[PDB]
Amino acid sequence: PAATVAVECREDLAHVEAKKDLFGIGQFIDPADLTLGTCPPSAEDPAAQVLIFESPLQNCGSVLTMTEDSLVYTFTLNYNPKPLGSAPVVRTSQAVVIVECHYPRKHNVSSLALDPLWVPFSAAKMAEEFLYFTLKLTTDDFQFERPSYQYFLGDLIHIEATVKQYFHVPLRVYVDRCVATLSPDANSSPSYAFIDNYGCLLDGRITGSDSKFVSRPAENKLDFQLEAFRFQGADSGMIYITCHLKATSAAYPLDAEHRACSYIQGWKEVSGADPICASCESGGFEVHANAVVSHGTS
Amino acid sequence: SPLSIAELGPLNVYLQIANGQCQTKGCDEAAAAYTSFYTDADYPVTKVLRDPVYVDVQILGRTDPNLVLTLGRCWATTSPNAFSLPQWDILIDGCPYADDRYLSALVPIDHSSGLPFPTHHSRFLFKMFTFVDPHSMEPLREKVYIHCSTAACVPGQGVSCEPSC
Amino acid sequence: PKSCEVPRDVRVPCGVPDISPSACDAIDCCHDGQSCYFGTGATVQCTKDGHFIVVVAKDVTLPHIDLETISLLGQGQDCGPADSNSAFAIYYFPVTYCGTVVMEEPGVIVYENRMTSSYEVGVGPLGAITRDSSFELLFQCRYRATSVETLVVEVQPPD
Numbered sequence: 356p357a358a359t360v361a362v363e364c365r366e367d368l369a370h371v372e373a374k375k376d377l378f379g380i381g382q383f384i385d386p387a388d389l390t391l392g393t394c395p396p397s398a399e400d401p402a403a404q405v406l407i408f409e410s411p412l413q414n415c416g417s418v419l420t421m422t423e424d425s426l427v428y429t430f431t432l433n434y435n436p437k438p439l440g441s442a443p444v445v446r447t448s449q450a451v452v453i454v455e456c457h458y459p460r461k462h463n464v465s466s467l468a469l470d471p472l473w474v475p476f477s478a479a480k481m482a483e484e485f486l487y488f489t490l491k492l493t494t495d496d497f498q499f500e501r502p503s504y505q506y507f508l509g510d511l512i513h514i515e516a517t518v519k520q521y522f523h524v525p526l527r528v529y530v531d532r533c534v535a536t537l538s539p540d541a542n543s544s545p546s547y548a549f550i551d552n553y554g555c556l557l558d559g560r561i562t563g564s565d566s567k568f569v570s571r572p573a574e575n576k577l578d579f580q581l582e583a584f585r586f587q588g589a590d591s592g593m594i595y596i597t598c599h600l601k602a603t604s605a606a607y608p609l610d611a612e613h614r615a616c617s618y619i620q621g622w623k624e625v626s627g628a629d630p631i632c633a634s635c636e637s638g639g640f641e642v643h644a645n646a647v648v649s650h651g652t653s
Numbered sequence: 654s655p656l657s658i659a660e661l662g663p664l665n666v667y668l669q670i671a672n673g674q675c676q677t678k679g680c681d682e683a684a685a686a687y688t689s690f691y692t693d694a695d696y697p698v699t700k701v702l703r704d705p706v707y708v709d710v711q712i713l714g715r716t717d718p719n720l721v722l723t724l725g726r727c728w729a730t731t732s733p734n735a736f737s738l739p740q741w742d743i744l745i746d747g748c749p750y751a752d753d754r755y756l757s758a759l760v761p762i763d764h765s766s767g768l769p770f771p772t773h774h775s776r777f778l779f780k781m782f783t784f785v786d787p788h789s790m791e792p793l794r795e796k797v798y799i800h801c802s803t804a805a806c807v808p809g810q811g812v813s814c815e816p817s818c
Numbered sequence: 819p820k821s822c823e824v825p826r827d828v829r830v831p832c833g834v835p836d837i838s839p840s841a842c843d844a845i846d847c848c849h850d851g852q853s854c855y856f857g858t859g860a861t862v863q864c865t866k867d868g869h870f871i872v873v874v875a876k877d878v879t880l881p882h883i884d885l886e887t888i889s890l891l892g893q894g895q896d897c898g899p900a901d902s903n904s905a906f907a908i909y910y911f912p913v914t915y916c917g918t919v920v921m922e923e924p925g926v927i928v929y930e931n932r933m934t935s936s937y938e939v940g941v942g943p944l945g946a947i948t949r950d951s952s953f954e955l956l957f958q959c960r961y962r963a964t965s966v967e968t969l970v971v972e973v974q975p976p977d
C-alpha cells in the first residue's frame with residue numbers, strides 16, 4: 356500500500372478510504388478481508404474503487420495517546436486474506452496499515468466584554484442650631500447670681516453676659532446694645548441706650564459715671580457694671596433692660612463692631628486694645644456738664 | 654516495516670458566561686446559574702461588583718467520554734487581547750488564585766449537572782471586580798475580559814486530568 | 819432622594835423622646851404617628867452641646883459601603899462609627915474633634931467636616947483591582963450666634 360489508505364480526521368469521527376486494489380496488483384481484494392480493527396468497511400465507491408470506513412474516534416480498535424502538541428488516535432487497518440472459496444488457497448499476502456489522527460491538544464479561550472457596575476455616592480448636607488446665651492444680674496465679684504433685683508440710687512448694678520461654650524471652639528461674647536425702658540417694650544418711650552454703637556458703654560461718657568466694662572473672666576464672659584438710675588417722670592420703680600448679645604470664636608479679630616468699650620478718662624477697651632474704641636465718640640450723644648459761676652468766698 | 658498514514662483534525666474549545674436564574678428563592682444558586690448561558694447579542698454584559706460570575710469552559714463536538722478538559726491559568730484583562738496588561742488572576746495551575754480575598758472557586762460538575770459528557774466541561778466562578786490604576790488607586794472605568802488556558806487530557810496515561818488543590 | 823420607608827427592625831430613633839411630628843421633621847427625621855426615626859439616606863444633625871450627629875444608610879452605595887473604608891477629615895478615636903446596626907451607621911463626635919474646619923460668617927459659626935471612603939485594592943504582579951464603591955459626604959453645622967437677652971431691675975431712692 357502506497358497511496359491506498361487515505362484518511363480524513365473530523366471532530367467526532369475518522370473517515371478512512373482504501374483503494375480496492377490495495378496492493379496495486381490489478382486484482383481487487385475481498386472487502387470482507389479488510390477490517391479496521393474488527394470493523395468492516397462501511398460503504399463502496401464503484402467509481403473510485405474505494406472501500407470507506409467511518410468510525411467515531413473511540414471505536415474500531417483505536418488507541419488514544421497524549422503528546423505535547425496533540426492527541427493521537429491510532430487505528431489499525433488489517434487485511435487478513437481468507438481462502439478463495441472451497442479451495443484452501445490464498446493468493447495475497449497479509450498486511451496491516453497504521454492510521455493516525457492528530458488533534459491540537461492545547462488552546463486558550465476568551466470571553467466577550469463584561470462591564471462592571473457600581474453606584475457611587477456624592478452629596479452635601481447642612482444643619483443648624485443656636486448658640487445659647489445668659490444675661491444675669493450678679494454679685495459684687497460677678498461670681499453668683501444676685502438673689503434680688505432691687506437697688507438703691509448710687510448702687511452699682513453688676514451684670515454678666517455669657518455665651519455657653521459647651522464643646523464649641525473657644526467663644527467670645529459681645530454685648531453691642533442695651534436699651535432700658537419702663538415698659539417691657541424695648542421701643543417704648545422713655546428709653547435709654549446705656550450700651551450702644553457695638554459695645555460702647557456710653558453711660559460713663561454721657562452721665563460722667565464709673566459705669567464700665569470691668570473685665571472678661573473668660574472670653575465667653577463679659578462683666579460690666581451700671582450705676583443705678585431712674586427716669587425723670589418715672590413713678591414706677593421697675594426698669595426693664597433689653598440687650599443684643601453676639602458671639603464669635605476667640606480667633607475672630609477684634610473689630611469696630613466687635614468690641615467692649617467704656618469711657619474712663621478716654622474710651623477704653625477691656626482686653627486693653629484701646630484704639631478700637633475711637634469711633635465710640637460719635638454724634639447723637641451729648642456729654643453732661645454741670646453749670647458754672649464766678650468765684651466767691653463764704 | 655508497515656505503512657503509516659497521518660493527518661490533522663480539528664478540536665475546539667469554547668468559553669461562555671452563565672445567565673441562569675434561581676428557580677425560586679432558596680434554590681441552589683450555583684446550580685441554577687449553568688442552566689442557561691449568555692449569547693453574543695447579550696454583550697457587553699453588565700454585572701455589579703462582588704457578584705458571582707459563573708463560567709463554563711467546554712470542548713465542542715467530541716463524542717469520546719475519556720477526554721477530560723483541564724484548565725490551567727484563567728485570568729482577566731482590560732482589553733480583548735489576553736496578553737494585554739493589566740491582568741488579574743482567577744485560576745492558577747487549575748486552582749483558585751490564593752492572594753485574592755474574594756476567592757475564586759471551582760464548581761464540581763458531577764452527575765448532578767447531568768451533562769452528556771461532563772468530562773468535556775470545566776466550570777469555575779469568580780467575584781466581579783473592576784481594574785484599578787495602582788498609582789492613583791482609582792477605578793479604571795474600563796471593561797473586563799475573562800480568559801483561560803486549557804488542555805484536553807487523557808486519563809490512564811502518566812498524566813493527571815484533575816487539579817489537586 | 820430621602821424616603822422614610824424603613825422597616826421597624828433597623829430603624830434608628832432620633833434622640834428626643836415623645837418629640838412631636840413637626841419637631842421630628844425639624845431635626846430631619848421621620849415620624850409615623852407613634853415614633854420618630856431616621857429616614858433613608860445620609861442625615862446630619864447638630865445638637866445644642868456642640869456635637870455632630872451623622873446617620874448614614876449602608877445602602878447609599880452599591881455594593882454597600884463598609885464602615886472601615888470611611889474616614890473623616892481628621893483622625894482620632896472618636897472619628898469611628900459610634901453605633902451601627904445591619905443597615906445604618908451612627909457617628910457622634912464633638913465639633914472640635916476629627917479635623918473639623920471652623921469658618922466665620924456674620925452671625926453664624928460654621929463647622930465643616932467630610933467623609934471619604936478609600937477603595938481597598940487587591941494588588942497582583944500584573945494588575946490592581948477593587949470590588950468597592952465610593953462614598954463622599956460633605957456636612958456642615960451652622961450655629962447661629964446672636965440672641966436678645968433681657969433682665970429687670972427696680973431702683974428706689976435711699977430710704
Ligand SMILES: *[C@@H]1O[C@H](CO)[C@@H](O[C@@H]2O[C@H](CO)[C@@H](O[C@@H]3O[C@H](CO[C@H]4O[C@H](CO)[C@@H](O)[C@H](O)[C@@H]4O)[C@@H](O)[C@H](O[C@H]4O[C@H](CO)[C@@H](O)[C@H](O)[C@@H]4O[C@@H]4O[C@H](CO)[C@@H](O[C@@H]5O[C@H](CO)[C@H](O)[C@H](O)[C@H]5O)[C@H](O)[C@H]4NC(C)=O)[C@@H]3O)[C@H](O)[C@H]2NC(C)=O)[C@H](O)[C@H]1NC(C)=O
Nearest residue numbers: 462463464725726727728735736746800801802803943944
Ligand atoms: C495561553 O495563556 C497562557 C497564560 O496566560 C500564556 O502563557 C503566558 O505567556 C506569556 C507571554 O509569553 C508569559 O509571559 C512571560 O512570562 C515569563 C516567565 O513568567 C514566569 O512567572 C509567571 C508569574 O506570573 C508565571 O506565570 C510563568 O509561568 C513563569 O513562571 C516572563 O519572564 C516574561 O517577562 C519577559 O517577557 C515579557 C514579554 O513576554 C517582557 O514584557 C518582560 O519585560 C520580560 O522581558 C524579559 O526580561 C528579562 C529581564 O528581566 C530579559 O532577560 C535579559 O535578557 C538579556 C538578553 O538576552 C540578557 O541576557 C540579560 O542578562 C537578561 O537578564 C529577557 O530577555 C526578556 N524576555 C523577553 C522580552 O521575551 C513574560 O512575562 C507568561 O508567563 C505565560 N504564562 C504561563 C502560565 O505560562 C500562553 O502563552 C497562552 N497561549 C496562547 C497560544 O495564547
